[PDB]
A paper describes a structure:
The genomes of most C. perfringens strains contain three separate genes encoding highly conserved GH33 CAZymes targeting sialic acid glycosidic linkages: the nonsecreted 43 kDa NanH, and the two secreted 77 kDa NanI and 129 kDa NanJ. Here, we present the structural and biochemical characterization of the GH33 catalytic domains of the three sialidases of C. perfringens and probe their substrate specificity. The catalytically active domains, which we refer to as NanHGH33, NanJGH33, and NanIGH33, displayed differential activity on various naturally occurring forms of sialic acid.
In contrast to NanHGH33 and NanJGH33 binding Neu5,9Ac2, the binding of this monosaccharide to NanIGH33 caused a structural rearrangement in the active site. The inability of NanIGH33 to recognize 7-O-Ac modified sialic acid in any capacity is likely due to the F353/W354 combination. When the 9-O-Ac pocket is unoccupied it appears that W354 blocks the region that would otherwise accommodate a 7-O-Ac (this position is the smaller P472 residue in NanJGH33).
Residue numbers in the entry: 1243 to 1690
Write the structure that this text describes.
Amino acid sequence: VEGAVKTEPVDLFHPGFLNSSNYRIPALFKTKEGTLIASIDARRHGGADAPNNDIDTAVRRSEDGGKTWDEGQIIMDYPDKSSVIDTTLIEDDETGRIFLLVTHFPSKYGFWNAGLGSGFKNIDGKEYLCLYDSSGKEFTVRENVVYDKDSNKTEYTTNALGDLFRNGTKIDNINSSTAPLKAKGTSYINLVYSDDDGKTWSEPQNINFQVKKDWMKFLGIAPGRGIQIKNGEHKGRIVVPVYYTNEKGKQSSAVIYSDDSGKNWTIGESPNDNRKLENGKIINSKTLSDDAPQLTECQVVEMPNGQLKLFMRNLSGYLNIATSFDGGATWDETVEKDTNVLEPYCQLSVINYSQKVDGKDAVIFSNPNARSRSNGTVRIGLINQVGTYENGEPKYEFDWKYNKLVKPGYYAYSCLTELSNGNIGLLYEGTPSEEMSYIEMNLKYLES
Ligand SMILES: CC(=O)N[C@H]1[C@H]([C@H](O)[C@H](O)COC(C)=O)O[C@@](O)(C(=O)O)C[C@@H]1O
Ligand code: NA
Ligand code: NA
């Protein structure tokens, strides 16, 4: 229709960009200053997930609303097939700090062979990263100084990137397949930040000790973006979606969150904790032993009164949605299935929209509208209150009033952002692992 805007797709990442053969897992965020930040997995040896790869994090910035992009940069690189995989972007608007979080594996590990727990150990009241030598002997890193199992200082020290130094000389890296001392083989949540709108980034912070429990096997970023809560008693809280597996390997969604500008983090309950399944059964993410109720990758959006809605990848064939009245710490016992929104077991994206649509508050949603990874569709969901819960909190439902096909053919992971002009930017997996595509869409297009 006249006035509609749907730009010709541009390959924001692609074979050869930054000398990476492959790319996957898009993330896209407009900062408060108005810059677009796009992060991606730079997969160096094919499209495969960890451990069968060597994956780095890359970033591109646009300062003119997505029309042109900078030459990019690798911001996280571990050696020897130690991977960083699945990034997520959020900003603290009060301090102007941008956060990027990612899952990290030592060489040879990934979601299915991850060992149990955080890989940290408590000594006299402080968590310390554990290291292991060839014979199984366990060490701790105390302010980057390696102590043996008798709290004897050794000759070894580390840095944030895991380099291992013997008397101040680098010999290896605790994440490699060859280091004399290796970190525990498991998932780690890593955090970097930018104070200059994304131009430069800090070294990775290993926050596993605050968010990974003893009984979790894998705990990883649910890729895409986070939020900072805008209304109510938890305003200012930074919410980052995650998901984890238990001993039996079953997956459950959650968010980690910080109320002190990213300094400390906690993990909330999963919507699977005390979940009431359809016919009344009560399960828990800790004990979950069946595949059916699994909740995995997810993204979160805020309702007008500050209530949280977690959109979750799952195994029912349809979108699943959890609700939290307490800023992400727990969820209502009922997980809703929207049979208006197919979910073929793939990552999805959902963001708040800043302006009313047809007089209603709205969200924007992206995913493959099929039983396969195809038929990529952006939707406008209008929020309606439909009564209240027993506890008197409002009950919110979505009306998927506008549904627009934007990518025929292959469509997998995606990430949305609202643009300074009020339009919608989208970075999506239009190929399985090569070209990653960026387009801009106005609501006139989406409503057509
Ligand atoms: C492997 C990983 O850390 N992330 C990958 C994730 C994951 O393997 C999938 O969610 C299943 O997780 C679990 C714990 O069973 O899913 C993808 O493999 C996919 O596109 O299906 C891409 C993504 O990078
Ligand atoms: Na690397
Ligand atoms: Na560390």
